[PDB]
Amino acid sequence: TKFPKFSQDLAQDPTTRRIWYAMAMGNDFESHDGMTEENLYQKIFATHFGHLAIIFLWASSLLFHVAWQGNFEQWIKDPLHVRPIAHAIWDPHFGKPAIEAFTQAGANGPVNIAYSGVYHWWYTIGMRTNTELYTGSVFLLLFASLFLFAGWLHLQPKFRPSLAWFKSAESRLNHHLAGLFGVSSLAWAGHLIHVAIPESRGQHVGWDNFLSTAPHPAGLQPFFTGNWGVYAQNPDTAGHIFSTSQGAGTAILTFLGGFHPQTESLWLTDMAHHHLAIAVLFIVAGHMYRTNFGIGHSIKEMMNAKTFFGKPVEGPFNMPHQGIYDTYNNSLHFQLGWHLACLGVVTSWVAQHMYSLPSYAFIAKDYTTQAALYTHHQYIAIFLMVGAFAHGAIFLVRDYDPEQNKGNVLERVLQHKEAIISHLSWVSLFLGFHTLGLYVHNDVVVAFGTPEKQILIEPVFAQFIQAAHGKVLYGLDTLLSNPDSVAYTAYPNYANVWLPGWLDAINSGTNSLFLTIGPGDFLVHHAIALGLHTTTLILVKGALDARGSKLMPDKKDFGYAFPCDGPGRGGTCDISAWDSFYLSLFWALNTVGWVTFYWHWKHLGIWQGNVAQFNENSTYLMGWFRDYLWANSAQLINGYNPYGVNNLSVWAWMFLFGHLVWATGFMFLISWRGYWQELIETLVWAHERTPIANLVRWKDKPVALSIVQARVVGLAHFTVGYVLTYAAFLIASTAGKFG
C-alpha cells in the first residue's frame, strides 16, 4: 500500500495501525529505512530551514493584522487606557448580540483584544505607524523565502554538505558565539541607538534619513579617539515623556540602572549599552577554538588530557572525560537532549525577569499581558526540560557505546545510579510529608477557629537575598541595605553607578522588583521544590534504567518506546523508558499550577492593592480554593448568562472546552485496549451482516488503538485541557477586573 515510504513493515499491515503509527515516526529519520548517516544529517539540515521559515511567516502574521485589523496608531496616543487589538473576527455563527459585545476597543466590527504584549514590544523599538509594520511583514516573507530556497538548495547533489562539515564542531562554536550571538547583539545596539533612542526622544529616524541623521552630536570622534565617556554625559531626565523631546537627552549609552519613571520599564539607553558589552565578550569568546588555522583550543585534546603541569592526573578536575567529545558529536540525541535543557532553563530565566524587570514600555500596567507572558514561557520551559531527558534516555538506548567511554565520567553515573534514584526519593518524600502536613495543620487549625495556632514561619534567609540588594523594609541592614558596607561604597573604586537608581526601584514598592516575601511564600517554594525533585526522579530513573533493570535487563534490545514485556515476572506494565516520560509530564504541568497560581494570586492582591488576603489566607489551602479560584471565576462563568452575553463569552466556552478535553483523556489512561478490541469486533460483525451497508466496506481493517498511542492520545487530552482551561481563567479573571 506504500503509504509509509520510510518503513516497509507498516506498509505491509492490513490494519488501521499503519495510519496512526505512520503519523508518529515520519519525523524519526533514524528509523527511516535505508537512511545513511550522510543523508540523515543532510535531511535534518534542510528541515531546519523549513522550520525557520514557519517562524518568520508567523511573525509576519502578527505585523500584518495589527496593520490592517488593528489600532496601533490609536494605542500610541493613550497606551494605558486603550486596549490593543490582535485581529478581527469573522464568524457566520455569531448573532447580533455577540457582534455587539465583541465590537470593542473603538472598532467598527467584532474584534479580539491582544494579550501577547507585542503592541508594547515594537512601540519601544521605534514603530510609530502602521506602514512601518507592513514593511516588516513583507520583509519577513522574503526573509523566509530566502531560507526555503536554501533548504532546497542543500538537498541538491553538488551543494549537499559532507558528514565532516557537520561534525566540524570547533568551527560552529566559533561562528555562532562570535557571529550569531555577538554580531546580532552588536547589530541590535545599532538599531537602539539609531532608531529607538531618537524616536523615543521624538526624532523620526527611518531608512530615508538614517545615513544623514546622527545618533549623537559629537559623532564617532569620541569612540575612535577613545574618549568614550562623552556618550554618557547628558542622560534622559526623570521627567522624560516617551516618544517626545520633553526632558530628553543626547546620551546613547548610559548606566542609570533602574526603571524609567513614566513607563515603569528599564532605561532604553542601558539596553543599547547592554548588547554592546555582550557582543564584545561573545566575539572574544568565539576565538577560543582551533577552527582551521591551528590557533585555539581543541575540545578533544582538552577532554582527553591526563596531565596537569607536573602531576599525572585522571582528567579535568581529576575526572575522566576521555570519550565525551565523540559521544557529543556522534550522537545527535545527546546534543538535542542537552541543548533543550540549556534552552529550557533560559526559557524560565526569561519569565523570571520580565515581570520583575519589564523591558518594554507600559507592560507593567497591562496586567493581563504580564500574566499570559509569564505562563507562556514557563509552560514552554517544561517541554524543553522534560524533552531533554526524553532524548537523554534515547541516547542511552540507541547511541551510547560503553566501549568508547570505558571509565568515562558517564560510566560512573550508571555504576552508582541506585544512589541517585534512591536519594531523590528521600528528598521527594521528605518534602511532601512536611509541605502537606504544614499546609494541613494550618488548614485544620483555622477550621476550628484558632488561626493563631498555625505554623507560620518566615522565609528568613530569603530576605537576606533581598537585604543584600537593598529592601530596607525588613531591617536587616546587610550589604546594600548597609550604607557603610564595602559593597555599598566600593573602597578601591567608588563606581557604584547602578546603586542610586537601582535602590530606588526596589524600595519604591509599586513595581514587582523583588516583591515582599511572607510565610505563605515559604511553603509554596517547597511545593515547587517537590515538583522539580520528583519530576527529575521519574526522568532520571527512566533514562538510567532505559538500558536495563533486574525486572527487564534486555530493555535496550526492545527500544525506547515499546508497550510492555508481558504479564510474567509479577507484571510489566510501564517498564519502557518512554513510559517514564509519560508519567513525568503529569507532574511538570502540576508544578506550573503551583507556580502560576502563586504568581497570579500574589500579583492580583498587589494590582488590586489587597496584599493582605494573600499574606493571610495563602497559609491554609481553603484560601487558594476560596479566595483565588472561587472568587475570580465569577466573571468567567457569567460570560454567557441567560440574560445576556458579554465580551468574555469565548473564555467560558474555552473554559468548559478544555474541561471536556481533560476528561476524554482519562478514558485512554484508565480504560485500556483489550476491552475495546472486543467491542470493535461486534461492530465488524454487524457491518458485515447489515442488509444494505454490506456494500460499503473498510479497506483497512479496523483495530483498536495500540497500548502506546493510547497513552499518547491521553496526554495531549490531559494537557490541552490543562492549558486551555487555565488560560481562559487566567485571562478572564485578569481582563474582567483589569487589575
Binding site: G548, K550, P553, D554
Partner: protein, 63 residues
C-alpha cells in the same frame, strides 16, 4: 565447585547478581551451566533456583 559451598554469582541480567547462594549439585558432564544453585531470595516469578557456569561462581565460603 564442590557441593554444599556458598558462591557469589557475577552474572549480569540475573536477579541474584552479586548475591550469595548455596550450590546444591554439580553435573559431571559436558553440559554448559552445569552447576545448580539455591538462593534464599526468590525471583519475581518465584523460582528460587537456576543453573550457572563455573566461571560466574566465586567461592565466598568453604563447604
Amino acid at each position: 565447585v564442590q557441593r554444599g559451598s556458598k558462591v557469589r554469582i557475577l552474572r549480569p541480567e540475573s536477579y541474584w547478581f552479586q548475591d550469595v547462594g548455596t550450590v546444591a549439585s554439580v553435573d559431571q558432564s559436558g553440559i554448559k551451566y552445569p552447576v545448580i544453585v539455591r538462593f534464599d531470595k526468590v525471583n519475581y516469578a518465584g523460582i528460587n533456583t537456576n543453573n550457572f557456569a563455573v566461571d560466574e561462581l566465586i567461592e565466598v565460603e568453604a563447604p
